[PDB]
Amino acid sequence: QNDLELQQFLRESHLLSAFNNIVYQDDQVIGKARSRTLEMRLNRLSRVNGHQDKINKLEKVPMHIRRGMIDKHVKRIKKYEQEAAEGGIVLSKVKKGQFRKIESTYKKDIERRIGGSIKARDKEKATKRERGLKISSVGRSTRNGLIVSKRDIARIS
Amino acid sequence: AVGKNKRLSKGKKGQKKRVVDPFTRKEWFDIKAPSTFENRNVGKTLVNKSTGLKSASDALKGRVVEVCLADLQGSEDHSFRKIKLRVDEVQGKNLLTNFHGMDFTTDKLRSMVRKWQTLIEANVTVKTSDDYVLRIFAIAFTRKQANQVKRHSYAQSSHIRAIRKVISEILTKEVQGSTLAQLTSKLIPEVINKEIENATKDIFPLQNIHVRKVKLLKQPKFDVGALMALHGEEKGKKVT
Amino acid sequence: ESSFMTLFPKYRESYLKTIWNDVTRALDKHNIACVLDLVEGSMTVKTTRKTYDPAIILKARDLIKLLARSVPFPQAVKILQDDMACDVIKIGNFVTNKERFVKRRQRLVGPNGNTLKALELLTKCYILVQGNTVSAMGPFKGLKEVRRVVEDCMKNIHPIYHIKELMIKRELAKRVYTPFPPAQLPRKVDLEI
Amino acid sequence: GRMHSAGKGISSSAIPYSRNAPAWFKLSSESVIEQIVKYARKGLTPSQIGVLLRDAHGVTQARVITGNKIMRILKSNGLAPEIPEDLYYLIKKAVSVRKHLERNRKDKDAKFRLILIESRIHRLARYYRTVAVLPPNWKYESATASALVN
RNA sequence: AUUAAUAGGGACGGUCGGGGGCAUCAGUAUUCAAUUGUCAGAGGUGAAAUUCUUGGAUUUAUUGAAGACUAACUACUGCGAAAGCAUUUGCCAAGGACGUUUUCAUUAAUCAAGAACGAAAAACUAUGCCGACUAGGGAUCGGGUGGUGUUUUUUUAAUGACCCACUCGGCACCUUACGAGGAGUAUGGUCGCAAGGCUGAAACUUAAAGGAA
């Protein structure tokens, strides 16, 4: 993990396959593999210390276009998951907000116009739900009811 | 160690002058199969000395040959089965074999194994009337009806244990009621597994039913009259 | 003459019924006839009277093996080529603790699939982890490497060690018991009794 | 409740609403009563008395047909047990398992099941002793119950 | 001389399971050996070496023993208190669920302490708001009830499979309703470090040998 280059090659394992269908080394790499993987490294290094909106702003796509893209994409993700789940193949796991990343998204570069996941649903889920206005401030509410301590019965007797 | 870089080992120190010409000294014997089969003629086999008539006879008594039931039985589908024939008599450029065992073939077993259904395996040890001791292995996979909608058809283990006991009963009553030619003629056209299917259709309908393997374990004292009878002694010609 | 048959499940039945025409035109380029049974759920390859590659009957057998193991059709015909063999690796019998076993399998696939994909690139193979069998395809030396790394992953060596090792190798190649239990402590009530 | 285990089952016999006789029953209370004491002289536990009388002779419940429950009919006839039937069956279970262990010294699961059964035996005996249907010095012990069965 | 809790026991009934115990039976491989062939190499690897081989290894054939394990079937699963459990046929007990117009009548729920059971080179990118909580939805395993036709068979033995409607109870998944420091730089301080006269060769301009040229 403290190594700097094995783990980099693990991270851009997918782009290299995608755009060279070896030359993992960053001084024989050529073409759109070189371009995209540089965009990768710069985003990671800046992500640890920049602010969330400016480190990943999305390009502008009108509404029906972007909704259409995400819909078609999610059907492709679920086809993949169904085919593996049937003919039982393990799949790497994803934090259940995020879109699973597959070889079609690495090729189409659809992450720049879709995003990691639907940010509105992310934020709205990660809020905590709002409690009521609270009233009876003398005892503890249990499954059985208000337990009212002897000391408090004394203090307001 | 062929090449020029390859160093000597203890290896090529004392060699042997190959002079003997083994495939001059050898001799060819024709073999032949019992009378329960169609294409009786098969095979020629070598004997490592000719100059032992009795020594040659000892080698050919020892032998075990095995052959595809297709070419043994006319039907040119290589019917995925093997007959081991054992040679236990000699007479004059003819070996008079006898039945020794049987097996399916691993590609046929892969050809039947399937995922959403269980297999049933019975393996009964029996005795024929000729005092041979047999071990017969029989296999059967459960099936879905001509009607179902559930996606998989598994047998509850009551049904499995009643099927295994039923298969055991049919096998042991049929082979104890056989003699060894009577067995072989039963085994050739696959009539046992119709008996199994017809007697197990009342439990949980099986599809794919077979007599997988037969292992011989015991033979009696050898029986020349019986064997030459099963196949079905001679003047010389007066060298002067 | 010779023929080999295998069986597939119904999801592959729909997929196969699409791709089948490319199979018969590829195998007839090699002169091998084939047939698909939706009635029983099988696939059969036969040689014909005009074929003459006795190895191709074994390779095409293995083609239908892969397609019913749900490897898609482009990777099937890569089995049909000459310097490629498939391989099934068993991983059922390496540990008992099932939690531990599932963790080790997922260690082989790894975050986003990275370790599997990086072995795929460094060994030119095509790996498919299923259940208890890791089915790979590739050139034979690739299969040597895969068997070593998957086996020691199911034993306790991290595949990331074997990936580092492969990368460097390639660079240099360029250069008392009782059964009766004790008594029971009595309750306060029964003590009062 | 459901201790010792993992199931939350509800599978009981539900008693019909009305506490009157069925409209088709035609026998007589003393006939049922003499039948019960006949079965007791045969030597059957009240559970079995009821299930015979439901199956064969067509009685719903003793308290429905006759005026009283079974074992008070028994006590009216001097047919009481020593120790009540659920305790008795429990003790039989525990000592039988104990014999099995003594045979098969390497049964961890049977050791565990013995511990659970005796736990029930202690609880039940405590309640029975509490209401005083058993003598207050009634002690379930290994050889005591073993010779009770022997 | 109460009711019989969608509280608890307990009995009975037909089952269900890769739960446990002792015993048995089988499977190919592997290791060892006997016997048989044929002839010079085998094994292993980035490449090799150690190693085994003309008292014949590897290889082929017939058999024998030996210890382990229980393939493919093997999951959208099953059983177990947890650790865990996988070929057969017995035997010994135990168990959940379901069925029940049986039986007892609050016998109870959670638990600090305490007791039973608990292989142990390991671990290494996972992560889900929860809650005493409302409706559901698809498949799944176990039992039960009705309907219904196909598979089935008919006086001697099993009268089991599938489809559908419900219905209890399970391991699950998909939806819903309400609710309580981090990163970096600077540093006339303290401690620790730290340099080079071509070497030999220093009291000696000091030979032979090198290192550079």
Swiss-Prot record, chain A:
Compartments where found: Nucleus, Nucleolus
Quaternary structure (record): Interacts with KRR1.
Function description: Required for pre-rRNA processing and 40S ribosomal subunit assembly. Seems to act in the processing of 35S rRNA at the A(0), A(1), and A(2) cleavage sites.
Record protein name field: Protein FAF1
Organism of derivation: Saccharomyces cerevisiae (strain ATCC 204508 / S288c)
Origin organism lineage: Eukaryota, Fungi, Dikarya, Ascomycota, Saccharomycotina
Gene: FAF1
Section of the entire sequence shown: 150 to 330 of 346
From Swiss-Prot, chain B:
N-terminal signal peptide: none
N-acetylalanine: modified positions: 1
Compartment list: Cytoplasm
Sorted UniProt keywords: Acetylation, Cytoplasm, Isopeptide bond, Phosphoprotein, Ribonucleoprotein, Ribosomal protein, Ubl conjugation
Main localization of the protein described in the UniProt heading: cytoplasm
Pfam family, one: Ribosomal_S3Ae
Residues annotated with Phosphothreonine modification: 240
Record's GO cellular component terms: 90S preribosome; cytosol; cytosolic small ribosomal subunit
Name of protein: Small ribosomal subunit protein eS1A
Gene (UniProt): RPS1A
Curated annotation (Swiss-Prot), chain C:
Phenotypic consequence of residue 190 to A: In temperature-sensitive mutant KRR1-17; grows normally at 25 degrees Celsius but fails to grow at 35 degrees Celsius
Keyword rRNA processing: yes
Lyase listed as a keyword: no
TM helices/strands, residue ranges: none
GO molecular function: RNA binding
Residue ranges occupied by any KH domain in the UniProt entry: 85-155
Gene Ontology BP terms: endonucleolytic cleavage in ITS1 to separate SSU-rRNA from 5.8S rRNA and LSU-rRNA from tricistronic rRNA transcript (SSU-rRNA, 5.8S rRNA, LSU-rRNA); maturation of SSU-rRNA; ribosomal small subunit biogenesis; rRNA processing
Domain of life: Eukaryota
Keywords for this protein: Nucleus, Ribonucleoprotein, Ribosome biogenesis, RNA-binding, rRNA processing
GO CC, alphabetical: 90S preribosome; nucleolus; nucleoplasm; preribosome, small subunit precursor; small-subunit processome
Subcellular location: Nucleus, Nucleolus
Chief place of localization: nucleus
Further facts: Present with 4340 molecules/cell in log phase SD medium. Cold-sensitive mutant KRR1-21 is a deletion of amino acids 234-239.
UniProt function note: Required for 40S ribosome biogenesis. Involved in nucleolar processing of pre-18S ribosomal RNA and ribosome assembly. Essential for vegetative growth.
Summary of subunit composition and partner proteins: Component of the ribosomal small subunit (SSU) processome composed of at least 40 protein subunits and snoRNA U3. Interacts with snoRNA U3. Interacts with MPP10, KRI1 and with ribosomal proteins RPS1A, RPS4A, RPS4B, RPS8A, RPS8B, RPS11A, RPS11B, RPS13, RPS24, RPS25, RPL4A, RPL7B, RPL8, RPL23, RPL25 and RPL28.
Family: Belongs to the KRR1 family.
Name this polypeptide is given: KRR1 small subunit processome component
Gene: KRR1
Curated annotation (Swiss-Prot), chain D:
InterPro entries (UniProt xref): Ribosomal_uS15, Ribosomal_uS15_arc_euk, Ribosomal_uS15_N, uS15_NS1_RNA-bd_sf
Subcellular compartments: Cytoplasm
Record carries keyword Ribosomal protein: yes
Disulfide-linked positions: none
Sites of the Glycyl lysine isopeptide (Lys-Gly) (interchain with G-Cter in ubiquitin) crosslink: 38, 42
Main location: cytoplasm
GO cellular component assignments: 90S preribosome; cytoplasm; cytosol; cytosolic small ribosomal subunit; nucleolus
Gene Ontology terms: biological process: cytoplasmic translation; maturation of SSU-rRNA from tricistronic rRNA transcript (SSU-rRNA, 5.8S rRNA, LSU-rRNA)
Keywords: Cytoplasm, Isopeptide bond, Phosphoprotein, Ribonucleoprotein, Ribosomal protein, Ubl conjugation
Entry-linked Gene3D superfamilies: 4.10.860.130, S15/NS1, RNA-binding
Modified residues annotated as Phosphoserine in this record: 31
GO molecular-function terms, A-Z: small ribosomal subunit rRNA binding; structural constituent of ribosome
Pfam families found in the cross-reference section: Ribosomal_S13_N, Ribosomal_S15
Subunit structure of this chain's protein: Component of the small ribosomal subunit (SSU). Mature yeast ribosomes consist of a small (40S) and a large (60S) subunit. The 40S small subunit contains 1 molecule of ribosomal RNA (18S rRNA) and 33 different proteins (encoded by 57 genes). The large 60S subunit contains 3 rRNA molecules (25S, 5.8S and 5S rRNA) and 46 different proteins (encoded by 81 genes).
Membership in a protein family: Belongs to the universal ribosomal protein uS15 family.
Protein name, entry field: Small ribosomal subunit protein uS15
